[PDB]
Design an enzyme around this catalytic site. Structure first.
Site, mmCIF file in Angstrom:
data_model
loop_
_atom_site.group_PDB
_atom_site.id
_atom_site.type_symbol
_atom_site.label_atom_id
_atom_site.label_comp_id
_atom_site.label_asym_id
_atom_site.label_seq_id
_atom_site.Cartn_x
_atom_site.Cartn_y
_atom_site.Cartn_z
ATOM 1 N N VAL A 1 40.405 29.060 94.666
ATOM 2 C CA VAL A 1 39.204 29.804 94.410
ATOM 3 C C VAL A 1 38.217 28.626 94.119
ATOM 4 C CG1 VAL A 1 37.802 31.128 92.790
ATOM 5 C CG2 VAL A 1 39.992 31.917 93.793
ATOM 6 N N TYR A 2 38.601 27.527 93.500
ATOM 7 C CA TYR A 2 37.338 26.538 93.183
ATOM 8 C C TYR A 2 37.528 25.728 94.421
ATOM 9 C CZ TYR A 2 38.300 27.457 88.198
ATOM 10 O OH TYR A 2 38.338 28.024 86.740
ATOM 11 N N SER A 3 38.292 25.533 95.224
ATOM 12 C CA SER A 3 38.057 24.526 96.444
ATOM 13 C C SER A 3 37.435 25.450 97.276
ATOM 14 C CB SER A 3 39.544 24.044 96.724
ATOM 15 O OG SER A 3 39.771 22.835 96.336
ATOM 16 N N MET A 4 37.095 26.663 96.992
ATOM 17 C CA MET A 4 36.720 27.894 97.837
ATOM 18 C C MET A 4 35.250 27.573 97.492
ATOM 19 S SD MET A 4 38.488 31.242 98.892
ATOM 20 C CE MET A 4 37.775 32.189 97.374
#
Ligand SMILES: [Hg+2]
Ligand SMILES: [Hg+2]
Ligand SMILES: [Hg+2]
Ligand SMILES: [Hg+2]
Lengths: 314, 314
Positions: free
Chosen positions: B128-131
């Site tokens: 979700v973060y690397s999103m």
């Protein structure tokens, strides 16, 4: 013994261990957890794939499913009970331990990410079983076979297969990977064929789901063992690839002629015997190995756009 | 140093190690995986609980969420970027490793069943973060703070806290359990408070969800460290219980006065400073410890039937 066979390859399986060092998939490096910017697309593709199909025990409603049960023969009845037990104490158990072993062996994060999903489910399948046992058997006591499993030609003959090909110091990744694929795909090909046939159309819904799922997932799983297999440089002499699936095929059958019916259950054994062969070949192929049994699907089975797409790529 | 404090208890924390042997929760026995017929109802209750709330990265739609972003200040802008990085390289990482340690320490299956869920998610939060980083920052390069994290008063002061209370040979389960609860509940109480405030009402939806969730889950998680804490016989002198949360409280704040704004972001720091205190006390209580800070919630916060039920049980 089992070695005499592996002794026949003490020159192409020596060069293999000697090459394992250079097998980057096992090139144990830092990546313990998935730093993002992913390199292994497929391995990840598969994670997200099975991840999509996640499910819980609550997804299995047992009642109005108890009916069709108590309104059946006396063996299909016990057949099931043995089925639901040969799992909750046999496979499901060794199942979880193995996944940690292989997970540990796999040096890439994205990979141990998939395995990390798998175990979680094996835990969740365990409850579906302890859901059906209470559902229509009231107590762990009420099951016969549930006491002398350790003393079943089949379970015994099975364990030897694992201790022989996986948990064995004198083994090779690619090899253990094959067998593991065998253990997941081949072993229990009947159980499904069975419950499929049964539940099929108008019999015990919940069970039909559980089996529909479990069987599905386990299909993806096996695939992973291949998806991993395809990454290794130095492959196992096709010969070795065979014995493995070959051995599994035979061990698998034994269950239906010894432990659980299929005869008393309500089917023409010679069929299950053949289907098992079916699965195995398709699995033999999936490891770069020519078909063996040359069986032909005996039951209308389900595990298009893509298939027909690639069919016209070849 | 840190020892001088623990030296003050070299008589009640000696009797503790000496008693750990008899701590059945750590009474390492066979149960590696959940044989069914469950004995620990609560621990399992919690597994199924968080299990219910499962979710994926796909559940986070990033676009039309990129808008509200590029249409903001220049720091809230970078504030986020630092936020989204202090995670993907700092917490999220140590996060996953810790869970294995504790999971290993916990001798009951049902328990390591919960932990087995948690890691899986920490993996899913990572995406979700690397999103969001790709979502509104285009590249890992485009982030400032993303290079000298190891050299941040706060991250550095944090790590010492873990190496000091958890990964430390001279530690006691109950203690490590407390801190771990501190690390999950207290550390990052701001981040949420922040993004909450922000997104709140008409700002970047996806982000509001991700934060709504993550914050939720991590709330359950912390709870588990308590649910486990409540099982131990020999508890840590309330004094020790305090320093832990106390230490965490202070380390937590530092981030908003040093690394990430809250001042430049758009809020009255003295508030975040107090909220952190809030959380901590409620956490102090949840370990059988009198309130300390005596703070009062500064923001309209959300993490009834039950609460009011038990309120009339007391
Ligand atoms: Hg299957
Ligand atoms: Hg394959
Ligand atoms: Hg939270
Ligand atoms: Hg608690």
């Amino acid at each position: 013994a089992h070695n005499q066979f592996l002794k026949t390859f003490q020159k192409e399986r020596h060069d293999m261990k000697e090459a394992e060092k250079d097998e980057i998939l096992l090139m144990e490096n830092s990546r313990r957890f998935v730093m993002f910017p992913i390199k292994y697309h497929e391995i990840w593709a598969a994670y997200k794939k099975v991840e999509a199909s996640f499910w819980t025990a609550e997804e299995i409603e047992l009642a109005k499913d108890t009916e069709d049960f108590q309104k059946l023969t006396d063996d299909q009845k016990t057949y099931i009970g043995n089925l639901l037990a040969l799992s909750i104490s046999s496979d499901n158990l060794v199942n979880k331990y193995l996944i940690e072993n292989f997970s540990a062996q796999l040096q890439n994060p994205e990979g141990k990410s998939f395995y990390g999903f798998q175990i979680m489910m094996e835990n969740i399948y365990s409850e579906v079983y302890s859901m059906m046992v209470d559902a229509f058997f009231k107590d762990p006591k009420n099951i016969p076979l549930f006491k002398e499993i350790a003393n079943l030609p089949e379970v015994k003959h099975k364990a030897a297969f694992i201790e022989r090909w996986i948990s064995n110091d004198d083994s090779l990744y690619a090899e253990r990977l094959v067998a593991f694929a065998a253990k997941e795909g081949i072993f229990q090909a009947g159980n499904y064929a069975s419950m499929f046939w049964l539940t099929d159309k108008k019999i015990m819904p919940g069970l039909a789901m559980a089996n529909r799922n479990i069987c599905r997932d386990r299909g993806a799983y096996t695939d992973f063992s291949c998806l991993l297999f395809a990454h290794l440089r130095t492959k196992p002499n096709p010969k070795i690839i065979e014995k493995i699936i070959t051995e599994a095929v035979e061990i698998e059958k034994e269950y239906y002629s010894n432990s659980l019916p299929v005869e008393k259950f309500g089917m023409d054994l010679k069929s299950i015997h053949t289907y098992i062969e079916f699965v195995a070949d398709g699995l033999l192929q999936g490891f770069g190995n020519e078909k063996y049994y040359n069986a032909v699907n005996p039951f209308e089975f389900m595990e298009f756009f893509e298939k027909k797409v690639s069919d016209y790529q070849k």
